[PDB]
């Protein structure tokens, strides 16, 4: 409401969006009942396919404090190449600012083969 | 952290700490100390009302329970070609190193002295100085 509160809301949204990215990273990496996650299994199949699905994998999460992150993962091959070493996966995590439809969006891209970060960005965005 | 999985976690943690640093700096700017404006507020209030204000950075740090550190720098400047407090914008820079590295996450938020409205915001992973 106030500009003072708007600042705090922007910061909380940045924090929640980042928490969503961490949640996604864990969902990707952490085994479930001793075997890869369904999300990892999907990207493993895509990474080893010469014409992979590019359908986003979408989820939403409510944290303990009631803040919400809307999360999407997707991948694409470097243009003109195939193979897992040329497959890069992007996590997008969005969280709306309280009392607003503006949102903070965190976008991190990592390589399937190395798990190294290729790019990272984060921005306050106006409402869709 | 040297594995790439840990590096990603360390990047996220440095982003958390930098963001929390900005939040604490905001509170330090705004919150009264003994019924009187904070010392950092009084300094920018003086600057905002000067035709040639000091552009000296004001430095602080915040150490968190997990042991991470945010280094804070605040400063201000008048909009080029303009004067007065309505045209005085203050920038908070908040840095935190990634664990096991001198690479860092830097959060930079600029707000207007008069309105307290956000004028710009950015954040980046940075290579070591
Ligand atoms: Cl790894």
Numbering used by the authors:
A (entry chain B): 12 to 139
B (entry chain C): 11 to 139
What wording appears in the published article?
Although it has a typical pilin size—17 kDa for the processed protein—PilA is an unusual pilin. To better understand the role of PilA, we solved its 3D structure by X-ray crystallography. After optimizing the best diffracting crystals and using protein produced in the presence of seleno-methionine (SeMet) for phase determination, we solved a 1.77-Å resolution structure. As can be seen in Fig. 2A, PilA—which looks like an “ice axe”—exhibits a typical pilin architecture, with an N-terminal α1-helix packed against a β-sheet composed of five antiparallel β-strands. A closer inspection of the crystal packing showed that PilA forms head-to-toe dimers, stabilized by a series of hydrogen bonds between residues in α1-helix and the last two β-strands of the β-sheet (β4 and β5). Strikingly, while PilA exhibits no sequence homology to other pilins, our structure reveals extensive structural similarity to the I subunit of HIJK tip-located complex of conserved minor pilins in a variety of T4F. Critically, since I interacts with J and K, this suggested to us that PilA might be interacting with another minor pilin (PilB and/or PilC) to form a complex capping S. sanguinis T4P. Using isothermal titration calorimetry (ITC), we showed that PilA has high affinity for PilC, with a dissociation constant (KD) of 23.8 ± 7.9 nM. The PilAC interaction interface involves the α1 and α2 helices and the first 2 β-strands (β1 and β2) of PilA. PilA thus acts as an intrapilus chaperone, protecting PilC from proteolysis by perhaps participating in its folding.
